[PDB]
Design a binder for this molecule. Structure first.
Ligand SMILES: CCCCCCCCCCCCCCCCCC(=O)OC[C@H](COP(=O)([O-])OCC(O)COP(=O)([O-])OC[C@@H](COC(=O)CCCCCCCCCCCCCCCCC)OC(=O)CCCCCCCCCCCCCCCCC)OC(=O)CCCCCCCCCCCCCCCCC
Ligand SMILES: CCCCCCCCCCCCCCCCC[C@@H](O)O[C@H](CO[C@H](O)CCCCCCCCCCCCCCC)COP(=O)(O)OCC[N+](C)(C)C
Ligand SMILES: CCCCCCCCCCCCCCCCC[C@@H](O)O[C@H](CO[C@H](O)CCCCCCCCCCCCCCC)COP(=O)(O)OCC[N+](C)(C)C
Ligand SMILES: CCCCCCCC/C=C\CCCCCCCC(=O)OC[C@H](COP(=O)(O)OCCN)OC(=O)CCCCCCC/C=C\CCCCCCCC
Ligand SMILES: CCCCCCCC/C=C\CCCCCCCC(=O)OC[C@H](COP(=O)(O)OCCN)OC(=O)CCCCCCC/C=C\CCCCCCCC
Ligand SMILES: CCCCCCCC/C=C\CCCCCCCC(=O)O[C@H](COC(=O)CCCCCCC/C=C/CCCCCCCC)COP(=O)(O)OCCN
Ligand SMILES: CCCCCCCCCCCC(=O)SCCNC(=O)CCNC(=O)[C@H](O)C(C)(C)COP(=O)(O)O
Lengths: 52, 88, 178, 459, 128, 603, 103
């Protein structure tokens, strides 16, 4: 039932695609923030509070 | 265990017992449907110490988000019976 | 646990939570009853000095110094009721909680035992079947457009209706199934 | 040896001319009968071997693997019986045909008096497994997996073939007996180094070595249950059999050359055992556990001592049985939940208690609990490595601890706690699954009574 | 006054000691309101898909699928060769191997020397 | 013929019959627990006979009955050792087990899976009997792992509880940490001595080197919860009370110490290992008593007391007195089992309440448990002509009269003081003050099972020390001469502990409240050891197992090197080769160039 | 604070339904309909079926199989003290050196 656009993509660069990713992950644009854009394959995924 | 199967009458009796013991409430003026803030003029801190007395009494503690919005003995007994799965 | 939280906690809610926690931790400190009563009354007298303060900035400055003090003096091993999230029997009987639908998978030789119970269960299933198709429309019409704003559910308003999404809250297994 | 090969070949006629609804029963019955026949090879001697003919010979290293190979087929049939219910009779018959072909190729591979014939059958075993994974696989990445599972092997296998033919031009024979009796030392030269590497790498890639273990999680996750069973139980043991057979010519160059692979295996067993701790998938977790166990077996083979070989043989047999059982349990979960992730379906012990017992037994035997043969092989390899060098005990102990940790983690996450609420389509376990697990576990606890049956020719 | 509790990675700041919560603004209240609105639409969708009598299967969770796919199959396509990544990979995958090789080679060299000079006392060393 | 062998094998054999009948119909009835209890009691009264035979004669024997696989010159066989230690420990364990199952028949009444509980208890008993009587290292390892697995199963008795599963995994972790040293010792012994048999190991090792003894010490420290690997025993209290009364207090946790008892001839010929054992035991007993001195949960403080007693036993081993350590095992089993039994009766009477802050006056509200616990506390502290006295008086006597460490001596004395102090803490806070439980009183004791089971161990804790000490043959030189003050140190220190702790607890009644110091906070959080060591290593492991292990090498770089570089190279050269526009002009020019190259290159 | 008027109605209906279900959870006197079909004294039988047969079997196996092979059972060679006599030979170990006895 799931679509292609639902899955994580590449690291967001513009505010528009950052916003689109935030809507994808069911979070506010102000609350969304990706991991640092380094070689490690986090890509486009929320860096949630580490809290246990 | 050997615990007697407590019933609604026992819960209400015990709650009214704890309510009567408290000095700030005249025993003859309270009731099952007696409100706390207006019927009896008890403070919010008075309601939280009533919650504390109930928690000590029954051996379990009520969540505060449920505790802060309990203002009558009848609804408190109802909440506790719902928590303890009481038949009658 | 039953009632849904709100979008935030007001100042009075926060002060009540601190009062509750502080009194509980003090009781954990004072094992004997008379000492606990004395220090709890002293605590309540200290607390009620500022009930009539009206400055929002002063109110914010208050209860925060109180929270830091409480964190310093919190009795690193507080008393917990056995069934509380920190108790010694918090989730003892979760291994005894089985769902309702497992009875749907019972062998007919097993279902031959307890026939009245399964007849009543059949009545319950029919009631749920009708009440659900009623509740779908009831919730679809009652909900604010653009999605719900609070996760609290409305009650039933006609005569034959039942509360929306009622089956799995009424049909909880038990507190102590065995 | 033909008394085992011929009935296996006749299974093909038996399945294709069977009634459209009687394929499973006939295949299961005759496979169990063939296992009973293959049990006869266990009567080995302390002398050379069981030289049946110029083409086939048996050994106390070949016999346990042959018996396990014959025994696995009924289990594979019973496991695959479920998810092939909605298939045409032609495709189910093709599936069973692939299974029989794989068993036949393994049977001919494990006797293989000659090295070139061994290589040919050892490479022919690739095709039916590839077809099973790529055709009766669920996801879209299965094709990719197949390519991986192919090319690695071929990249490893091609120099070996060259090495093999070169050997026949210099020695004059590739029969195992002449090779053993006429063996001569290998002078430490560059050409001999490359010969050693060519002879070893083909089997090293299939074990798999820690560096070359990428293919195994993909192949296990993508394969159907029968593919996972045959890959975990037997298809990983081909590398061990090949190295054990081929190391005789490689002396004395083995002592110098073995250091990189020994270091890789000793560190990679820790690395994959730790990887098992953070895994969101059952089949991936069991794949990494298989990598750890086969790394220990690689260490045992490279050490090249009597205790090393005995422990390696015992561990190969035990790990095959245990991994097949664990994959069966995971597939039992998948066919019910259709998710294949550990965290979703939870607290199943309250709901499936006897399957919880099977889970506990499989986890205990994967944990290498004494006196199971898993621990027998583990302890023999550990003692041999300690004799090799006293520092290895640290790594072995770390591996044992992490093994216990991840095995009990895999038991805890799935069986204990509270069930997921929204799940309701979980039906009570069938008799087929319970019989599958019982037939998996009983041979292990029976074999621990007679360990000498699975300790190899160096016993 | 009382001594300050210092938060750490493994012992985080208490909920009631955050300076951020006490700085209240209508923007912050709107943020919390929309957060709870998102939480409530999620809860409503879950309960609607949950209490239906017709449904007899797993409720597929988009969040869990995103979690698993990001963990497993999204790593390499987003990888880039960086000095940090290259150095970390080379270190953590190469250094331990050479370290253990050095340790074991040194130990075996010492043992072989002790063997050749004859003072190792291998009496009763029969199984190897 | 010589009924020693027949009786000593029949005991263990009949211990397993209910396990064989676990598939029968009786397992589906309510009479199974009674069946198991009767079987174990009969086993105990049957094992009483070889003990009498040894007492009369001193008869020792080795029974190698079944021959397992033989590996070249090494021979493995099912061998049982029936020395003084085995024949002495068997009846004590069976007696304590009988008492524990009699208690369980009442405590686990409302448990739907009670037959499974009794089956688990009997499996643990069988595994411990296997461990004790083993003659070779392999059978010892079999028992070693069996008891640990049964402990894991019994701690996580309520699988719906997250913390119970956490405690079970913690016990497994620490026991595997000890297993590292165990396997090290086994490998060393086979490699050098060429056998796993105790006889050949003793024979061929006149001066045992460091490595095997260090491995044995690591295994014993892992199993007995010494200072390095202590917290699993306090955390093991999550399981039901009889499990903690049998396994984690008196039978399983002595096994590691018992292992160091088994190899005492090799322990006596090495001095560094003895020093390490002594120091580890001293630090363990002191730390555990200090932790116990501020605990509110009753099971936790009794568990810490058990840990301190195990540390004392390790000190006794370190001072080269194995027989005294074994005697201390024997008496500790009795009185600690009865202590935990009293605690369990208390907890059941107060609706599963374990914190002592909600427990007040039970001296008169329930008198038999009061007198049993007071006897047990007096015995544990150690008193003249009390069971704990023989083990306690002798241990202090020997450590004081030996060439040991002064620091270990001092920590042992402070440990005795803290032992008396926590005993008076528990009795004071649980039996003397005003009641503090919920008003609904469900206090009851009139149950024959609890009374008989408690009184059997009471009779044991009063008489067994004297009877056994005066019954066994002498095995060591006694300290007959001593300065009067040095003879009395144990009594004076226990009296000071009693008095000082009593006076400190008496100040609680005062209407004054002050904030604790740093020392109390350090003592309450278990020296902060469970915090740091359960958050710092784990995290730094788990993170790595995902970052460097899972993604960095396996998913990226190992993928990059062999397969991905190959794929990219194939892609590029395929594109280069196949990209021809089909103009025969370029093909013909290239053909001419190649013809020229061939004419100029190959000749 | 407190519940809202609408909230009370939901709790009332839900709690009454919960009571109905929880009452339905009870049992009738005939509900466990069991289908029957078949095909000192306690201690006396237990003492022979659980003690006597095992000792018989173990003693047989020890005396006639285990002890048949050498070195399977090895004893302690019991202590010999001065003044005793040995049944097999009949000699007496000589007494000691008559140390001075006082206190
Ligand atoms: C030791 C005395 C035993 C003598 C009697 C002989 C019995 C032979 C049985 C052999 C194994 C059974 C087959 C395995 C699958 C179980 C089948 C099943 O479905 O159960 C249904 C049945 C009823 O279940 P249910 O009520 O319908 O459902 C409830 C739920 O399932 C809930 O399930 P549950 O919670 O009730 O779990 C059932 C139970 C049992 O389930 C199991 O887990 C069975 C597996 C146990 C060990 C796991 C493998 C570890 C490696 C050891 C391998 C040794 C093999 C030796 C030869 C084996 C011969 C076949 O689990 C446990 O209690 C944990 C056991 C862990 C023990 C750890 C220590 C083991 C090593 C100790 C030394 C062994 C050799 C001694 C040598 C020196 C002394 C002479 O359960 C039983 O019948 C219980 C079995 C009795 C306990 C056996 C545990 C010890 C046996 C070890 C191997 C045999 C030793 C041989 C000589 C020993 C002297
Ligand atoms: C459910 C609750 C319990 C009910 C049942 C209670 C009864 C329990 C008894 C069962 C086990 C308890 C231990 C008792 C052991 C007695 C039997 C044992 O002694 O016999 C063994 C014999 O067993 C066999 O050796 C082990 C069987 C090997 C299993 C082979 C696998 C089976 C084929 C299946 C396909 C293979 C798949 C795996 C390929 C390798 C060892 O024999 P051994 O002491 O030496 O010499 C025999 C006498 N000799 C000298 C004349 C020869
Ligand atoms: C990626 C996951 C694992 C993949 C497989 C890894 C295992 C294969 C690695 C092979 C190990 C080394 C190969 C050759 C070993 C020879 C011994 C050498 O290391 O020692 C010195 C050799 O000296 C120098 O090392 C010469 C070799 C230098 C050139 C080799 C390249 C080194 C790095 C390349 C590694 C890349 C491997 C994979 C490529 C695809 C001793 O000096 P010398 O006494 O004079 O030579 C002795 C040999 N004689 C007797 C024949 C003369
Ligand atoms: C029970 C039902 C029948 C009761 C009546 C029979 C009573 C005894 C009569 C049987 C005669 C004895 C017998 O069977 O023969 C001995 C026979 C073995 O023959 P051997 O030649 O001595 O050695 C095997 C190598 N060839 O012994 C037996 O098998 C029976 C007793 C063996 C011990 C019981 C096994 C219990 C442990 C199970 C295995 C545990 C794992 C391995 C342990 C590791 C130990 C380091
Ligand atoms: C001398 C020359 C040596 C040549 C050796 C050949 C090695 C075998 C691998 C050949 C790969 C060639 C194909 C290729 O690179 O294409 C990339 C291709 C693109 O996919 P397409 O299906 O074409 O289209 C997708 C979009 N629609 O990528 C893939 O899918 C490949 C996935 C499977 C890879 C399998 C792993 C192969 C490497 C392992 C061992 C091979 C090493 C060979 C020897 C190494 C030196 C000792
Ligand atoms: C998992 C995939 C890995 C694939 C295996 C890679 C390692 C195998 C080594 C490369 C192939 C070599 C095959 C050689 C076959 C054996 C023949 C032999 O040993 O005979 C030698 C021949 O030796 C050679 O010719 C070796 C030359 C190799 C050329 C191609 C090498 C391919 C690249 C090598 C670099 C990688 C080496 C290690 C890689 C390890 C795996 C990654 C003697 O030659 P003669 O002239 O007849 O002797 C007369 C004089 N005494
Ligand atoms: C052992 C642990 C020690 C912890 C110590 C913590 C320090 C304690 C000292 C606290 C000092 C204060 O009072 S901090 C004072 C914070 N500011 C105010 O209280 C202003 C107005 N007060 C309210 O509105 C309340 O709700 C009220 C009217 C009281 C009740 O309301 P109700 O009518 O709805 O019951």
């Amino acid at each position: 039932h799931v679509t292609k656009d639902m899955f994580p993509g590449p690291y967001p660069k513009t505010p528009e695609e950052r916003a689109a990713a935030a809507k994808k992950y069911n979070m506010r644009v102000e609350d969304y923030e990706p991991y640092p854009d380094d070689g490690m394959g986090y890509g486009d995924y929320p860096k949630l509070p580490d809290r246990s | 265990s050997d615990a007697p199967p407590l019933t609604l009458e026992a819960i209400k009796d015990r709650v009214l017992y704890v309510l009567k013991l408290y000095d700030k409430i005249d025993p003859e003026k309270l009731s099952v449907n007696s409100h706390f803030m207006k019927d009896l003029g008890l403070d919010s801190l008075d309601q939280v110490e009533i919650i504390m007395a109930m928690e000590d009494e029954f051996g379990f503690e009520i969540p505060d988000i449920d505790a802060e919005k309990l203002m009558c003995p009848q609804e408190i007994v109802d909440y506790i019976a719902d928590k303890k799965d009481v038949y009658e | 646990a039953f009632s849904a939280p709100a979008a935030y906690l007001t100042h009075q809610q926060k002060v009540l939570r601190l009062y509750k926690r502080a009194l509980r931790h003090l009781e954990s400190w004072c094992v004997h009853r008379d000492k606990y009563r004395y220090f709890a009354c002293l605590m309540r007298a200290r607390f009620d000095e500022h009930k009539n303060e009206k400055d929002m900035v002063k109110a914010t400055q208050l209860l925060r110094q109180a929270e830091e003090e409480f964190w310093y003096g919190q009795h690193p091993q507080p008393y917990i009721f056995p069934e509380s999230p920190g108790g010694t029997s918090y989730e003892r009987y979760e291994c005894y909680k089985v769902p309702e639908w497992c009875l749907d998978d019972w062998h007919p030789s097993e279902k031959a035992m307890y026939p009245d119970y399964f007849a009543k269960r059949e009545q319950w299933k029919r009631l749920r079947r009708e009440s659900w198709e009623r509740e779908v429309k009831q919730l679809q019409e009652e909900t604010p457009p653009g999605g719900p704003r609070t996760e609290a559910l409305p009650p039933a308003r006609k005569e034959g209706d039942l509360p929306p999404l009622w089956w799995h809250i009424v049909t909880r297994p038990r507190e102590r199934p065995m | 040896m033909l008394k085992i090969i011929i009935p296996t070949t006749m299974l093909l006629p038996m399945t294709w001319m069977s009634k459209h609804n009687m394929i499973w029963i006939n295949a299961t019955v005759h496979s169990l009968l063939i296992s009973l026949i293959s049990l006869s090879l266990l009567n080995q001697l302390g002398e050379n071997s069981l030289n049946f003919s110029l083409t086939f010979f048996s050994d106390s290293l070949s016999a346990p693997l042959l018996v396990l190979t014959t025994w696995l087929l009924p289990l594979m049939l019973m496991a695959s019986q479920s998810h092939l219910s909605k298939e045409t009779t032609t495709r189910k018959k093709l599936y069973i045909t692939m299974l029989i072909l794989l068993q036949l190729f393994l049977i001919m591979t494990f006797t293989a008096t000659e090295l070139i014939l061994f290589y040919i059958l050892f490479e022919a075993t690739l095709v039916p497994t590839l077809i099973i994974i790529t055709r009766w696989g669920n996801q879209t990445e299965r094709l990719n997996a197949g390519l991986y599972f192919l090319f690695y092997t071929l990249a490893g296998s091609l120099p070996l073939l060259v090495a093999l033919v070169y050997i026949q031009n210099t020695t004059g024979s590739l029969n195992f007996l002449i090779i053993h009796y006429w063996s001569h030392p290998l002078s430490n030269s560059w050409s001999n180094i490359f010969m050693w590497l060519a002879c070893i790498m083909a089997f090293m890639v299939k074990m798999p070595l820690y560096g070359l273990h990428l293919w195994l999680p993909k192949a296990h996750v993508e394969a159907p249950i029968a593919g996972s069973m045959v890959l975990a139980a037997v298809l990983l043991k081909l590398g061990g059999y090949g190295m054990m057979r081929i190391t005789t010519i490689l002396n004395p160059l083995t002592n110098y050359m073995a250091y990189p692979f020994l270091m890789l295996s000793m560190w990679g067993m820790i690395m994959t055992s730790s990887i098992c701790l953070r895994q969101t998938d059952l089949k991936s977790l069991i794949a990494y556990s298989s990598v750890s166990h086969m790394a220990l077996v690689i260490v045992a083979i490279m050490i090249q001592t009597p205790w090393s070989f005995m422990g390696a043989t015992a561990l190969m047999i035990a790990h095959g049985l245990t991994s097949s059982m664990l994959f069966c349990l995971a597939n039992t979960n998948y066919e019910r939940v259709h998710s294949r992730t550990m965290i979703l379906a939870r607290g199943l012990q309250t709901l499936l208690p006897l399957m919880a017992t099977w889970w506990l037994v499989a986890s205990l035997t994967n944990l290498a609990l004494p006196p199971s043969i898993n621990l027998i092989g583990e302890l023999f390899i550990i003692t041999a490595s300690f004799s090799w060098s006293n520092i290895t005990i640290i790594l072995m102990g770390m591996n044992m601890m992490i093994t216990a940790l991840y095995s009990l983690y895999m038991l805890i996450t799935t069986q204990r706690g509270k069930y997921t609420h929204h799940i309701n389509n979980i039906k009570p376990s069938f008799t087929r699954e319970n019989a599958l697990m019982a037939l998996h576990i009983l041979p292990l606890l029976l074999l621990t009574l007679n360990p000498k049956m699975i300790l190899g020719p160096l016993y | 006054s009382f001594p300050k509790y210092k938060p750490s990675r493994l012992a985080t700041l208490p909920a009631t000691l955050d300076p951020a919560e006490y700085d209240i603004s209508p923007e912050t209240r709107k943020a919390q309101a929309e957060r709870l609105a998102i939480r409530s639409r999620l809860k409503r969708e879950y309960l609607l898909q949950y209490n239906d009598p017709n449904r007899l299967g797993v409720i597929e969770d988009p969040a869990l699928i995103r979690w698993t796919y990001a963990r497993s199959a999204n790593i390499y396509p987003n990888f880039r060769p960086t000095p940090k990544t290259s150095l970390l990979g080379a270190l953590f995958g190469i250094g331990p191997l050479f370290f253990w090789y050095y340790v074991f080679k040194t130990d075996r060299d010492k043992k072989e020397k002790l063997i050749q000079e004859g003072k190792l006392d291998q009496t009763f060393n029969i199984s190897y | 013929m010589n009924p020693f062998a027949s009786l000593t094998l029949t005991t263990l054999t009949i211990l397993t019959i209910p396990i064989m009948m676990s598939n029968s119909n009786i397992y589906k009835t309510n009479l199974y627990p009674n069946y198991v209890k009767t079987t174990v009691s009969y086993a105990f009264t049957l094992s009483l006979v070889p003990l009498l035979m040894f007492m009369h004669t001193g008869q020792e024997m080795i029974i190698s009955n079944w021959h397992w696989m033989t590996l070249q010159t090494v021979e493995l066989s099912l061998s049982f050792k029936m020395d003084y230690f085995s024949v002495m420990f068997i009846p004590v364990a069976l007696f304590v087990t009988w008492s524990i199952m009699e208690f369980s028949m009442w405590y686990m009444h409302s448990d739907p899976f009670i037959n499974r509980f009794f089956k688990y208890l009997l499996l643990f008993l069988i595994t411990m009997m296997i461990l004790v009587t083993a003659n070779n290292l392999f059978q010892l390892f079999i028992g070693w792992e069996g008891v640990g697995i049964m402990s894991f199963l019994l701690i996580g008795w309520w699988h719906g509880r997250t913390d119970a599963n956490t405690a079970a995994l913690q016990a497994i972790l620490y026991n595997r940490i000890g297993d590292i040293g165990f396997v090290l010792s086994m490998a060393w012994f086979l490699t050098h001595s060429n056998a796993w048999d105790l006889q050949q190991i003793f024979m061929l090792n006149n001066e045992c080197p460091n490595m095997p003894l260090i491995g044995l010490l690591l295994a014993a420290a892992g199993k007995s919860a010494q200072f390095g690997l202590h917290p699993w025993l306090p955390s093991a209290m999550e399981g039901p009370t009889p499990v903690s009364a049998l396994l984690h207090s008196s039978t399983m946790v002595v096994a590691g110490v018992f292992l160091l008892i088994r190899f005492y001839p090799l322990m006596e010929t090495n001095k560094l290992v003895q020093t390490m054992t002594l120091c580890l035991g001293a630090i363990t007993t002191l730390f555990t008593a200090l932790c116990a001195i501020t605990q509110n949960d009753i099971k936790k403080i009794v568990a810490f007391s058990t840990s301190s007693q195990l540390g004392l036993m390790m000190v006794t081993i370190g001072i080269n007195q194995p027989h005294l350590a074994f005697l201390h095992i024997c008496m500790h089993a009795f009185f600690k089992a009865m202590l935990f039994m009293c605690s369990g009766s208390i907890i059941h009477s107060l609706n599963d309440e374990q914190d002592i802050r909600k427990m007040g006056g039970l001296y008169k509200a329930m008198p038999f448990t009061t007198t049993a616990l007071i006897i047990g506390s007096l015995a544990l502290t150690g008193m003249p002509y009390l069971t704990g006295f023989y083990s306690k008086d002798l241990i202090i006597e020997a450590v004081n009269m030996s060439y040991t460490n002064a620091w270990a001596l001092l920590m042992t004395l402070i440990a005795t003081s803290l032992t008396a102090a926590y005993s008076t803490r528990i009795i004071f806070f649980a039996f003397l003050g005003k009641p503090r439980f919920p008003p609904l009183v469900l206090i009851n004791e009139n149950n024959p099972l609890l009374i008989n089971s408690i009184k059997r161990l009471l009779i044991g804790s009063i008489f067994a020390g004297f009877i056994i000490s005066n019954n066994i043959p002498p095995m060591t030189v006694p300290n007959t001469t001593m300065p009067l003050y040095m003879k009395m140190t144990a009594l004076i220190v226990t009296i000071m502990g009693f008095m000082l702790a009593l006076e400190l607890n008496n100040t609680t009644y005062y209407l004054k409240f002050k904030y604790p110091s740093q020392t109390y906070k350090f003592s309450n959080m278990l020296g902060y050891y469970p915090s740091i060591m359960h958050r710092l290593p784990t995290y730094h492991n788990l993170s790595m197992s995902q970052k460097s292990a899972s993604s960095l090498l396996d998913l990226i770089w190992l993928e990059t090197i062999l397969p991905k570089t190959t794929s990219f190279i194939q892609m590029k050269m395929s594109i280069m080769v196949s990209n021809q526009k089909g103009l025969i002009k370029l093909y013909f020019l290239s053909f001419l160039i190649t013809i020229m190259i061939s004419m100029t290159l190959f000749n | 604070s407190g519940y809202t008027p609408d909230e009370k109605l939901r709790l009332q209906q839900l709690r009454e339904l919960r009571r109905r279900w929880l009452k339905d959870q009870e049992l009738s006197p005939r509900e466990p309909v069991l289908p029957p079909r078949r095909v000192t004294y306690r201690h006396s039988i237990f003492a022979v079926t659980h003690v006597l047969i095992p000792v018989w079997i173990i003693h047989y196996y020890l005396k006639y199989h285990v002890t048949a092979k050498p070195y399977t059972v090895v004893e302690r060679k019991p202590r010999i003290f001065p003044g005793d006599t040995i049944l097999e030979t009949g000699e007496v170990i000589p007494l000691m050196k008559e140390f001075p006895d006082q206190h």
